[PDB]
Amino acid sequence: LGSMSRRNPCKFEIRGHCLNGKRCHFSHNYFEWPPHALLVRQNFMLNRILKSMDKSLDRTEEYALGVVGVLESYIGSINNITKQSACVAMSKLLTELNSDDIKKLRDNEELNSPKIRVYNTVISYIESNRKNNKQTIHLLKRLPADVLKKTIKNTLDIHKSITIN
Amino acid sequence: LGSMSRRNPCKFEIRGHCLNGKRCHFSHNYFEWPPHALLVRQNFMLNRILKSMDKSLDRTEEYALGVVGVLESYIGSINNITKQSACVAMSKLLTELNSDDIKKLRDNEELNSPKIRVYNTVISYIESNRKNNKQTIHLLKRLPADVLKKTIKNTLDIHKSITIN
Amino acid sequence: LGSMSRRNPCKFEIRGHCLNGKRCHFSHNYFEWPPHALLVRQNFMLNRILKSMDKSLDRTEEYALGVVGVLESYIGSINNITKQSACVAMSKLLTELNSDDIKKLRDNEELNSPKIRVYNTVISYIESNRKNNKQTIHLLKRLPADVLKKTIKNTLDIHKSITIN
Amino acid sequence: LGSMSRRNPCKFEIRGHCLNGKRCHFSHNYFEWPPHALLVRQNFMLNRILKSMDKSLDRTEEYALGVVGVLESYIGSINNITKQSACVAMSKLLTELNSDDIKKLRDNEELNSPKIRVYNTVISYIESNRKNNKQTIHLLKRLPADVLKKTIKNTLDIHKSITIN
Structure with a gap:
């Protein structure tokens, strides 16, 4: 048997x-x-x-929020999130996205739609962040709060969007 | 329950x-x-x-054509494709193929079939492109249009062939 | 047919x-x-x-015991396990764990629970061991037996725990 | 619908x-x-x-024989296989095996069984070949034919054995 x-x-x-x-x-x-x-x-x-092939906000509150919660919290000046922290988390977010997805979105647009500009900016940041996140981070740290928070918001929107279509 | x-x-x-x-x-x-x-x-x-372990025509028309559409377009002098662009796309195509597949094809041939010559050439380009695509690209850029377009055509034929048998 | x-x-x-x-x-x-x-x-x-992307107790008894058996044996001074061997096996154990799992545990704790201290220590050793195990090993070799065996015991407990919840 | x-x-x-x-x-x-x-x-x-993470007998007859056929052919002095070729193929064979499998075999043996000696030799060659195959190859090239062909035969036996138990 x-x-x-x-x-x-x-x-x-x-x-x-x-x-x-x-x-x-x-x-x-x-x-x-x-x-x-x-x-x-x-x-x-x-x-x-x-x-093990990766290259180089660990506290309880940050962990529970995750990189997205941290970035959303910085934009609303809550939860005690520094600009430094928001720029690291942003690198982490950019590592998680991939350009090829921005490009499929980009080619659904009417020519000279304003959204094409924002895509190519995010795409540009992914590539930079891929090359060297530490450089890329510094670069985000020099941006003025208002513009940083807008770039961030754009990135999060695309992140969510890619995942729910 | x-x-x-x-x-x-x-x-x-x-x-x-x-x-x-x-x-x-x-x-x-x-x-x-x-x-x-x-x-x-x-x-x-x-x-x-x-x-993330890879080493180093992003526009709307190129993206829609893909590397194959770009290469086919260069060969027919349409769609505004430069020789530079066709040589990058060719590297990308060569990265996507693998020698072991050319070799299974190669050994289905009568001895001194003329097709054995073309296989070993493509195989040779894959290996070179693997070593250094930037070198390999330059090398394609120096080839005369007529021969380039013929090598390309050979590569595309094998690409298609491997995938539909 | x-x-x-x-x-x-x-x-x-x-x-x-x-x-x-x-x-x-x-x-x-x-x-x-x-x-x-x-x-x-x-x-x-x-x-x-x-x-093939990894960086650098092979005998019969060690193999049968495995890294866990070796570490358990050192703590009870049986089976003829040196402190050197126990420190290599410990690196191997630390390579097998991952911080993200310690962190999910860590955030199930009442604030200033004493267990939060031990977690952050193990987490700290994983990161170090990831950076350079050879350095990390030496570091374990300098710890006094009593404390070493306690750190070890903590690590094994977490290892088992992660796997049975 | x-x-x-x-x-x-x-x-x-x-x-x-x-x-x-x-x-x-x-x-x-x-x-x-x-x-x-x-x-x-x-x-x-x-x-x-x-x-794409690998580090560095392509002809028709060699391809049909494969690395195993080449090694078997050298041992019987047929098919026109040089000692150079047999030593490359041997590296390729050693890359395909893994020590952990030799070790599970090794621990099925009576103590000081003569087979334990051969295992530890093959295991030793895998590790060396992993470190640097080019060094390892040279090393095989200096061995006298009789001993080479015996080491080879041992390796092939283990290769087959691992796969059919």
Whole structure:
């Protein structure tokens, strides 16, 4: 008939690599895992590969707000958000976006629509931020509050927009 | 019975990383996502990892044509495509192909078939372009129009061919 | 009707790349593979990409214990584990964890809970270990046994905890 | 009712990135793809990421034999395989294996089994080859034919063995 039983996938392994040696009784053999476990492991591992190739507001309130909450809070001068913090979070936001999405938007516009100007500006900041975020940050720090908060607002709008169409 | 409800996966997270902190009510826990969402996220994340390890015609018309449309347009002297532009797009095309596919084609040929010569040329350009695209581009810029447009045409033919067999 | 038969996926390819040339009769065409095989291959390949971007207790007993067994054994002065070995294994453990998980834990705490202090310490070690494990290791080697074994114990507790909630 | 129809995924995109701009009528939206297509794309993309992070017998006969056929052919002095070629192919074979698999084998052995010696040798070559294949190759070229062919044979045996258990 077979064995009564099969071994379940190891939860440590689903998150990366099990560090428990032979002491461990769960399965570490991908050929016997159900698909869901293998799909979950792939997402943990992709996060790890991506983090380990990255180049270089950790407190409780900032974490709960996230980069978006911090940026929204700076624009409304609430929650005690400095301009320094808002400029780091902005780099983080720009790293999360990608130009190719701005470009699909950009080409849905009537010619010399004013929105084409804002797109190309955000696109420009993504590229710069990709090259060197530390440079890019400084650059945001020199912008006057009013214009900074407007660029930010533009970026957040596009961020949301891309994700809900 | 359980709860009446389960949380849906977060669309921001499906595209990368949700930047909305604790403010966000959607699921960010891969163990509770349905498979489709996890498969979609993997493709967004692979695109990101691949882009962030790359080394270095953005206008509306070029974007709509794509690298292939630009290359086809240069060969027919339409759409206002410079030789410079056609040589960049060609590098982009060569980055998208891979030698191993030319080689499976190459070994379907009668010995000293003339097609073996063209394959080994494209293969040669992929390798060069991999090493340094900027060098490779210059090299394409010095080729005479007639021969350039023929090499291009060869590359596009193989590109299409690999994808429809 | 079709052919009586389809080719099965190649087990070498499921693990990476088949090195058997045309001599091989199994399928190497991902369009004809069943989903399970493609999910298994992705996990082998992600392990390979991750290993090939990493920067730099191999014996039988250590391997069976794993990094966790080694660390648990040092704390109880059994199994013949040196302080050197325990500090390498600790780096390996810290590479396997990620800060973002400590931070989700950290924000479940009453303000000035003593546990917040320990979290921020582990978080601090992950970041350091990420920067340079060799530096980080030395740093662990200078800590006095009693405190080392306590930091270790904290790390293992969090490791287990993250994985079973 | 909905539309009569849905767009099929783009075969170019399944293999990487479609370079056909807006001219293209197939779907490039991963949210509407069926799972199989998304699983196939992930394997093409993982191959690309892996190739683009690699560091540095292309002829018809060699390609058909593959690295394994070349190595088997050298050992039997057939097919016109030089010692140089056999040493490159050997590096390629060593890149495809991974130590962690030799180690699971190694710990299935009675103590001071002679097989433990051979494992640790192969393991040693993988690590060296990982560090610098060009160095590692030279090193294989200096080994005397008889011993080379024996090391090779050991490596192939383990390669096959790992894959069929």
